Amino acid sequence: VNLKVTIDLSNPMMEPGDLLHLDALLGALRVSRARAEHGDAINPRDYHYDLPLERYQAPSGDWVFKASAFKLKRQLPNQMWMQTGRLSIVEAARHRQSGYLQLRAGKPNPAGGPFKTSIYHRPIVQAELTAFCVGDQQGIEALLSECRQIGGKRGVGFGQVAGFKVEPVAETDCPWSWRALPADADPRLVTSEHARCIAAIRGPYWDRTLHVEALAPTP
Amino acid sequence: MQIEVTVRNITPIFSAAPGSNYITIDGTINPPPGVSRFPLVRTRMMYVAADVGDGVIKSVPLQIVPGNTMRSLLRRTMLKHVIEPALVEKGNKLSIGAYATAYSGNATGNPDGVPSSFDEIATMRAHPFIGLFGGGPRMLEGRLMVDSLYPIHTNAERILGAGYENEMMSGPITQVVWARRMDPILNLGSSEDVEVINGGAVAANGWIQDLLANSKAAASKKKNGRGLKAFNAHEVVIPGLKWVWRISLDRPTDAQVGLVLLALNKMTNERIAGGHSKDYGRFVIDGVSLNGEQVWSQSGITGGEQYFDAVAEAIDGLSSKEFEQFAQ
Amino acid sequence: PADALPGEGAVREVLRPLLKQAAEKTAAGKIVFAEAATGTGKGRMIASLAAAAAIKGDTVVVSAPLAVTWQLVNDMKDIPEVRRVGLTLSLGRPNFISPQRTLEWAIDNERADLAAWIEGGGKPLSLRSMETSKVISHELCWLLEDALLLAEDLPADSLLLTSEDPADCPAQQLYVAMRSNYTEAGIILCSHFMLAAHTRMMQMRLSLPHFIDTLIVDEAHLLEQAFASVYTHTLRLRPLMRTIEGLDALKELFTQMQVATNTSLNVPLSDVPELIPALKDTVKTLGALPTKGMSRDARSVIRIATRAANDALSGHSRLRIEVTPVHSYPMLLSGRSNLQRALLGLWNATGGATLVSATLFTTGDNGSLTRWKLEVPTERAAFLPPVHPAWTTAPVLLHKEFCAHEPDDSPEWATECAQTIQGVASTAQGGTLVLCTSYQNTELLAGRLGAALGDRLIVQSKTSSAATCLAQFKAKHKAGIRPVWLGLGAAWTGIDLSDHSLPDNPELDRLLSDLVITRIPVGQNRSLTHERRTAIGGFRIISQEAAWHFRQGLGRLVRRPGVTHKNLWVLDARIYGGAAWVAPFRQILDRYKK
DNA sequence: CACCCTTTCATTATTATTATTTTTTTTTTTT
């Protein structure tokens, strides 16, 4: 069908390290749908490939999904978010006296451990997210109806979806090739911004054990 | 399911922001160099998209509480108000690494990556407290999505959505409250006020010459210790402001929603600030809407009795071995 | 059209999609925001919604202005479903006349047809009246329109059916007997003023059902103002002073009323130095007058004055001052600037609702201020995509030239603007309406165009209403001359400038060949609720309300498809400037080309 | 060996920071 998807945001989102792939979003959405439709005790490996997309096979094995990465059009300047983590030492002391806490140590450590105070900063972007993929529009709408967040499923409030839209477009307009690809991809599919690296091309893109020698685009 | 808590802060809201922020004595934020400046810790604000003005999107500041503060506040009020009395009426003794997993979002039960079977993932996500946040070495996704405390403000109309146009604020919502510390040895009046000091007059005089020598040496260096005499500034969000709080639960049980409801029943004693000395962040709850239906009353929560019975039989049955098995 | 709604086949094909989701989301119990243009036939789609809800067993209430009433019951006569379930109308006291007073005026003014009409029962004479009497199956005698058709110059306020009329005059038990019209039919038509008055009757604890299962509001953009019309109780001083002669405390109320160009706007009790003892003396000297011997039409004036004073006394209402256009008479208002309670009391009393209007939505699919004005609950709100067809913007030609002077209520702007009106009127092949927002600038344009244009011009003023001006526009378009119309107020919103002399052929429509907007209508809405809503929202609410007023101003050109050679002119130099606040005003002008 | 203390090492270096400029109308057909 060769269609193209935009998501616009009611909340700013985490700017993704490497590429936010649309098939990763659809896989997480299908995992959530399978959690609703079976229950909680399931394998997420089973259903995060059950996607209404096309599957491109490279000339000697190394198959990937036919879904390009999310291109970002910044509505806002790329700001930064800070978050911190620390266990409240005062309640720990009162629980240590009350007997509810069993702590042999009589001193915390903000540089490391359970009472470590940690500060960390992540980029924040408010953007129009446009991806390109070949597949069925109805299934992508049914998946993205549950998509309340994108980029980070943080549970803390980021990336809340104002809306989404899928439209079919012509073949020559669509740059599907802008995606993490295997190194044995076709010569018409390799572009200049693609470069050879270690990257995941499929499924869980955070899982470094599945990371392969791949040719991928730069965000 | 969604819980929207509309609260008004009785006292100002202060959630400190990073960076080096400088204000003059008049009020100019971030002056150019060559003029006297001042240390300032502003409340936390994000640049958010705005369709106000024109149809094109402009970046406007919006002064919020971060969602992590909301998540930890909800967590800590469930521990302080229902979880801890239940676990000390039974005699349960938590361990550090299980206490660190329940009270913080940390993995010091085992710093190692603990493998998680899908059955044990299911049996810990259905726990009345544990499945809301998760945490620990399992690093499993908690069911509770806690949003930032958003003020009902025209800069947040994209975040707030339609329906909050009635009872809505505009314009500036931050006031730079100036605070100070005086050296209290200078406040010492006479022999009756100074007799409690070891040394008394001699010690007070010695601190006065030490502070004088340090200040004149610092001023001569201007043309590394520090005294007690400070005077600084911090932006706070104005008191009496109305705030919305979005708590969306990803396929919850009845006991988990009951635990969130009993948190909202007792969170009037909690605070939301970096101003605990100054009683900042005291709030009262004006509305709690479950799935679009308001449930808050003046005498706590009236409604959702199935959630209340579920959370009663949930917090009665816990024996803290599930917390220990959640940690390791 | 398989599995179509009742009456769907008479609805146009473009409005079929709006009708389907409107029926669907009113079947779910949500309040539906459905938006379509003027000439797309919203009455037929509303009829389909009313019939499809009526076959479910629902008590359906359709609220609309009285001009829209005849075409709404014209769309509700021939479909068999509302024939089976019945259609009735609820009409008030201002739909009827006093028979004794109208007969006494007809004898005094020697009107033979009016007196012969009253003697005999006041039988209906207009085709609308007997046809509505056939549809309701309740006889509609003593109609104000039927009496008006025989005598255009009757004092309709003086001959009116008041609440203080005796029980034996025929129109009063006519209205009383009718008040139970909602029991005998499944679909009840009402006005917005009827629905708001009966909502006030609900809130203070008859003519409409206690629970409306399905409510369709025609021209919903007006409806909140009708509520704003209902909850203002006004004390008129000069009719009281002429009635008492036929107290000194009300004269002292006028003297203390004098000391308080903004005269006490949006102030309920901010300043009351002598306002509340004077109000108490007014109440006690007006309520203790003897009812015996005092006239049957005077007690209406006394009672509306005491009701307005008792609304004033509580302190829960705002106070406003205005003067009549005729002279500087004493006019005082006790109105409500907050309206969440009463309209919310209507929405829990509505199962599902469709709010149809010509300017309902702000920008695209944003209607947030709309559910702010009517205080629609967000849980029950339903925002449908609007219908904006191409033929509304197809024949209209937008001209690049304009008036370089900014509108600043100055005579030099009046001269340059009037030279542009002279240019447009020279290039006009028909009628021209030039739209203003104020009396002062339209008198400036009248003084700049009087000797220039002569008999071609129509002006609106304190002595020239919109209806008189509109009637003159048809009159000198019938004579073959090309009129210009310095129109304001109701000339912006709610006038039909499509001719009825050529129904079947709209391609020869040249009654209004030129719309010229002289200035952007900013600062038009001065009501209490809009002032309070502006004080919350800010500059944005002023800009969006100006956008809605300008959209209603531009909607006067195309009223039906098939017209040709339509000209649109905008002479405000702020539009073509580099200012950003006129940005929506450009994008609506971006819907026209060349 | 799980519970902690307390030691240890590391090379370059600079600093900018979004905030606004209405008009004053007289409609409508309620009790």
Query: Which residues have C-beta within 8 Å of that of residue C373, sequence separation ≥ 6?
Result: C224, C529, C533
Beta bridge partners of residue C363, listed in sequence order: C366
Question: Are B292 and C536 within 8 A, CB to CB?
Answer: no
CA atoms within a 13 Å half-sphere pointing along the CA-CB vector of C124: 15
Beta bridge partners of residue B146, listed in sequence order: B247
Could you give the CA distance from residue C310 to residue C283 in angstroms, rounded to a whole number? 8
Q: Does B234 touch chain A (CB under 8 A)?
A: no
- Three-class secondary structure assignment of B139-204: CCECCEEECCEEECEHHHHHHHCCCCCCCCECCCCEEEEEEEECCCCCCCCCHHHHCCCCCCHHHH
Question: Are B95 and A102 within 8 A, CB to CB?
Answer: yes
Which residue in B170, B244, B290, B293 has the most chain C C-beta atoms within 10 A of its own C-beta, making it the best mutation to test that interface? Answer: B170
Q: Which helix (H) or strand (E) holds C357?
A: strand C350-357
Could you give the CA distance from residue B14 to residue B22 in angstroms, rounded to a whole number? 17
In angstroms, the Cα distances linking C323 to C258, C270, C525 are 12, 21, 17
Distance from CA of B275 to the nearest CA of C (A): 30
Cβ neighbours around C389 below 10 Å, total: 16
Could you give the CA distance from residue A23 to residue A28 in angstroms, rounded to a whole number? 9
Query: Which residues have C-beta within 8 Å of that of residue B13, sequence separation ≥ 6?
Result: B43, B65, B149, B236, B237, B239, B241, B272, B273, B280, B281
Question: In this complex, which of C372, C378, C538 lies closest to B154 when CB atoms are compared?
Answer: C538
CB pairs under 8 A between B and C: 42
Q: After which residues is chain B broken (C to N over 2.5 A)?
A: 223
Can you give the C-alpha Rg of chain C in angstroms? Answer: 25
- Dihedrals φ, ψ of A55, to 5°? -120, 110
Q: What residue type is assigned to position C491 of the chain?
A: A
Nearest to A28, CA basis, from B133, B128, B116, B250: B250
Number of helices (H), then strands (E), belonging to chain B: the values are 11, 15
CA-based angle A188:A190:A193, to the nearest 5?
A: 135
Documented resolution in Å: 3.0
The strand pair at B144-146 and C566-570 is best described as unpaired
Q: From the CA of B304, how many Å to the C1' of D22?
A: 49
Q: Which helix (H) or strand (E) holds C484?
A: strand C484-487
Nearest to A48, CA basis, from A20, A65, A27: A27
Q: Which two tokens stand for residue C356?
A: 């149809």
Distance from CA of B167 to the nearest CA of C (A): 8
Q: Which two tokens stand for residue A80?
A: 């930064």
The strand pair at A13-14 and A118-125 is best described as antiparallel
Question: Are B292 and C379 within 8 A, CB to CB?
Answer: yes
Reduced DSSP (H G I as helix, E B as strand, rest coil) percent helix, strand, coil of chain B, to 5: 35, 25, 40
Query: Which residues have C-beta within 8 Å of that of residue C541, sequence separation ≥ 6?
Result: C369, C530, C533, C534
Q: Does B162 touch chain C (CB under 8 A)?
A: yes
CA dihedral (C112, C115, C120, C121) positive or negative: positive
Q: Can you state the angle between helices C42-54 and C66-74, rounded to 10 degrees?
A: 70
The strand pair at B21-22 and B39-41 is best described as antiparallel
What is the greatest pairwise CA distance in chain B? 73
Cβ neighbours around B131 below 10 Å, total: 27
The answer to whether the beta carbons of residues C509 and C337 sit under 8 Å apart is: no
Mapped onto helix, strand or coil, the DSSP state of residue B46 is strand
Q: From the CA of C580, how many Å to the C1' of D21?
A: 13
Residues of chain C numbered 330-359 and touching chain B (CB < 8 Å):
340
Q: Which two tokens stand for residue A29?
A: 């959405």
Nucleotide closest to residue C324 (CA–C1'): D26
Could you give the CA distance from residue C381 to residue C69 in angstroms, rounded to a whole number? 26
CA dihedral (C277, C278, C280, C281) positive or negative: positive
The answer to whether the beta carbons of residues C347 and C31 sit under 8 Å apart is: yes
Residue B14 CA from chain centroid, whole number: 9
Query: Which residues have C-beta within 8 Å of that of residue C84, sequence separation ≥ 6?
Result: none
Q: What is the dihedral of CA C240, C246, C252, C255, to 10 degrees?
A: 70
Which residue in B4, B52, B54, B56 has the most chain C C-beta atoms within 10 A of its own C-beta, making it the best mutation to test that interface? Answer: B54
Q: Does C578 touch chain B (CB under 8 A)?
A: no
CA dihedral (A205, A209, A210, A212) positive or negative: positive
Q: From the CA of A108, how many Å to the C1' of D5?
A: 12
Nearest to C232, CA basis, from C314, C312, C330: C312
> Residue C104: is it exposed, middle or buried by C-beta count within 10 angstroms (0-12/13-18/19+)?
middle
Nearest to B316, CA basis, from B308, B305, B325: B308
Q: Which two tokens stand for residue A86?
A: 């620390």
Q: Does B168 touch chain C (CB under 8 A)?
A: yes
Could you give the CA distance from residue B81 to residue B254 in angstroms, rounded to a whole number? 19
The strand pair at B2-9 and B242-249 is best described as antiparallel
Contacts 24+ apart (CB under 8 A), B270-278: B270/B73, B270/B76, B270/B77, B272/B9, B272/B13, B272/B15, B272/B65, B272/B69, B272/B70, B272/B73, B272/B149, B273/B11, B273/B12, B273/B13, B273/B14, B273/B15, B274/B14, B274/B15, B274/B16, B275/B11, B275/B12, B275/B14, B275/B236, B278/B11
Cβ neighbours around B194 below 10 Å, total: 17
Could you give the CA distance from residue C338 to residue B167 in angstroms, rounded to a whole number? 12
Query: Which residues have C-beta within 8 Å of that of residue A119, sequence separation ≥ 6?
Result: A82, A83, A84, B18
Q: Which superfamily does CATH assign the domain made up of C396-590 to?
A: P-loop containing nucleotide triphosphate hydrolases (3.40.50.300)
CA-based angle C65:C71:C75, to the nearest 5?
A: 125
Could you give the CA distance from residue C550 to residue B235 in angstroms, rounded to a whole number? 42
Contacts 24+ apart (CB under 8 A), B84-89: B84/A95, B84/A100, B86/B315, B86/B316, B86/B318, B87/A100, B87/B318, B87/B320, B88/A98, B88/A99, B88/A100
Q: Which two tokens stand for residue B261?
A: 């409801």
The answer to whether the beta carbons of residues C143 and C275 sit under 8 Å apart is: no
Mapped onto helix, strand or coil, the DSSP state of residue B213 is helix
Could you give the CA distance from residue B168 to residue B241 in angstroms, rounded to a whole number? 9
Question: Determination method here?
Answer: cryo-EM
Q: From the CA of B273, how many Å to the C1' of D16?
A: 28
- Three-class secondary structure assignment of C88-123: EECCCHHHEECHHHHHHHHHHCCCHHHHHHHCCCCC
Mapped onto helix, strand or coil, the DSSP state of residue A110 is coil
Q: Where are the alpha helices (DSSP H) in chain A?
A: 22-37, 44-47, 89-98, 137-144
Residues of chain A numbered 103-162 and touching chain B (CB < 8 Å):
103, 105, 113-116, 119, 121, 124, 126, 148-149, 153-158, 160, 162
Could you give the CA distance from residue C220 to residue C36 in angstroms, rounded to a whole number? 12
Q: Does B250 touch chain A (CB under 8 A)?
A: yes
Q: After which residues is chain C broken (C to N over 2.5 A)?
A: 205, 246, 260
Q: Does B170 touch chain C (CB under 8 A)?
A: yes
The answer to whether the beta carbons of residues B23 and B38 sit under 8 Å apart is: yes
Q: Can you state the angle between helices A137-144 and A22-37, rounded to 10 degrees?
A: 70
Q: Does B111 touch chain A (CB under 8 A)?
A: no
Beta bridge partners of residue A79, listed in sequence order: A124
Nucleotide closest to residue C228 (CA–C1'): D28
Query: Which residues have C-beta within 8 Å of that of residue C568, sequence separation ≥ 6?
Result: C396, C397, C398, C399, C515, C517, C554, C557, C592
In our burial notation (b when 16+ CB lie closer than 10 A, e otherwise), range A202-219 reads: bbbbeeeeeeeebbbbee
The answer to whether the beta carbons of residues C466 and C457 sit under 8 Å apart is: no
Cβ neighbours around C239 below 10 Å, total: 14
Could you give the CA distance from residue B294 to residue B3 in angstroms, rounded to a whole number? 9
Could you give the CA distance from residue C465 to residue C462 in angstroms, rounded to a whole number? 7
Mapped onto helix, strand or coil, the DSSP state of residue C131 is helix
Distance from CA of A58 to the nearest CA of B (A): 33
Beta bridge partners of residue C568, listed in sequence order: C398, C515
Positions on chain D within 7 A of a protein C-beta = 3-6, 15-31
Question: In this complex, which of B54, B55, B165 lies closest to C369 when CB atoms are compared?
Answer: B165
The answer to whether the beta carbons of residues C435 and C488 sit under 8 Å apart is: yes
Q: From the CA of C93, how many Å to the C1' of D31?
A: 10
Which residue in B20, B48, B146, B150 has the most chain A C-beta atoms within 10 A of its own C-beta, making it the best mutation to test that interface? Answer: B48
Question: Are B165 and C536 within 8 A, CB to CB?
Answer: yes
Q: Which two tokens stand for residue B256?
A: 């988990």
The strand pair at B94-95 and B58-63 is best described as unpaired
Minimum CA–CA partner of B53 in chain C: C540
The answer to whether the beta carbons of residues B258 and B310 sit under 8 Å apart is: yes
Mapped onto helix, strand or coil, the DSSP state of residue C397 is strand
Minimum CA–CA partner of B166 in chain C: C372
Could you give the CA distance from residue C470 to residue C433 in angstroms, rounded to a whole number? 10
Minimum CA–CA partner of A158 in chain B: B147
Q: Where are the alpha helices (DSSP H) in A6-100?
A: 22-37, 44-47, 89-98
Q: Does B144 touch chain A (CB under 8 A)?
A: yes
Could you give the CA distance from residue C318 to residue C336 in angstroms, rounded to a whole number? 6
Q: Among all protein residues, pick the one whose CA is nearest to the C1' atom of D25.
A: C524
Contacts of A36 in chain B (CB under 8 A): 251
Question: Are C368 and B163 within 8 A, CB to CB?
Answer: yes
Q: Does B106 touch chain A (CB under 8 A)?
A: yes
Reduced DSSP (H G I as helix, E B as strand, rest coil) percent helix, strand, coil of chain C, to 5: 45, 15, 40
Could you give the CA distance from residue A56 to residue A77 in angstroms, rounded to a whole number? 35
Cβ neighbours around B121 below 10 Å, total: 20
Contacts of C372 in chain B (CB under 8 A): 165-166
Distance from CA of C384 to the nearest CA of B (A): 14
Q: Which helix (H) or strand (E) holds A213?
A: strand A212-216
Residue with tokens 């006093």: C98
Which residue in C373, C379, C585 has the most chain B C-beta atoms within 10 A of its own C-beta, making it the best mutation to test that interface? Answer: C379
Query: Which residues have C-beta within 8 Å of that of residue C525, sequence separation ≥ 6?
Result: C545, C549
